[PDB]
Structure formats: C-alpha cells, structure tokens
Amino acid sequence: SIIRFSVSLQQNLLDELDNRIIKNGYSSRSELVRDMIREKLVEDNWAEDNPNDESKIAVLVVIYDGGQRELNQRMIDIQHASGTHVLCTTHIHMDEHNCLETIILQGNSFEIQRLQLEIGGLRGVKFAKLTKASSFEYN
C-alpha cells in the first residue's frame, strides 16, 4: 500500500530539481516530490466544485500584536462573518506585542481562504499562513 512508479523527465529538469535540493533541507528527492505531489493535489482539490460544501478542515497560523487595540476583535469579527467554524484556538503570549495563534477551522474552501486573506491584511498581523487538508488524505 505504498506504491512505486517511475517518472520520466529530461536529464536537465531532473538536475534542475537536484541542484535545487542541494540547498534544500529535504532528506531526499523522493520525499521532496512526494510532498510536492501532496501539496499540489490538495491545492487542486481546494480549487473545485461546491460552495455548498462546508466540510474542509484547515489550520490558520497567525502571529499578531495582541497589544494593538481592536486587532483581536477584528480577527474575531472577520471569522464570525466568514461562515467558517472554529473548532479550537490555541494562543501563546510571546511578549507585550506578539501573540501566536493556531486556529483550527472547518468550512468551505472559499470561506477559509478568504479568512486567511482578510486577516493577513490587517495592520499588526505579522504572519498568517494556512495549512490545508483534503479528505483524500485522511478518509
């Protein structure tokens, strides 16, 4: 249940990929490609069909100035308006002007990606990255 298949490609592309792995942490080529395939297949899945589907899972990671007035509440307001469901939030108080949150979200692809974009655009948000999951990965 862990299959091998061969990929054909011109030696120049393989080396291009190999050159790029020399400066990369990636333990191995197969591992890099496997993870690229996963990432791309998830992206493709998130790009399609129904806005009726309210069942994608994702995690939004944010670093922001929790000392800034209105900022936390603006994030809450945006999440409330998005239609997404927050399953759980973990918050670390890093210092006077930095908080890290991991926000576990469920909802449709649109609602979730829009939440990331809106939050990432706020003054005082220093970092906002979404981790996507697709059902083929866990069902």
Which residues of this protein are in contact with Ni ion, per CB under 5 A?
66, 93, 99
Burial class (CB in 10 A: 0-12, 13-18, 19+), 19: exposed
Known binding-site positions for Ni(2+): 80, 91, 93, 99
- The two tokens of residue 10 are 């011109």
Closest residue by Cα to residue 110 from 47, 19, 61, 27: 47
Residues 68-97 that bind a second copy (CB under 8 A): 87-88, 90, 92, 94
- Which one of a second copy, Ni ion, none interacts with residue 66, CB within 5 to 8 A by kind? Ni ion
- Which one of a second copy, Ni ion, none interacts with residue 109, CB within 5 to 8 A by kind? a second copy
Closest residue by Cα to residue 132 from 17, 43, 50: 43
Task: Say if CB 128 and CB 71 are below 8 A apart.
Answer: no
Binding site for a second copy (CB under 8 A): 1-17, 20, 23-27, 29-34, 36-41, 44-46, 48-51, 57, 59, 61, 63, 87-88, 90, 92, 94, 98, 100, 102, 104, 109-110, 113, 117, 126-127, 129, 131, 133-134, 136-139
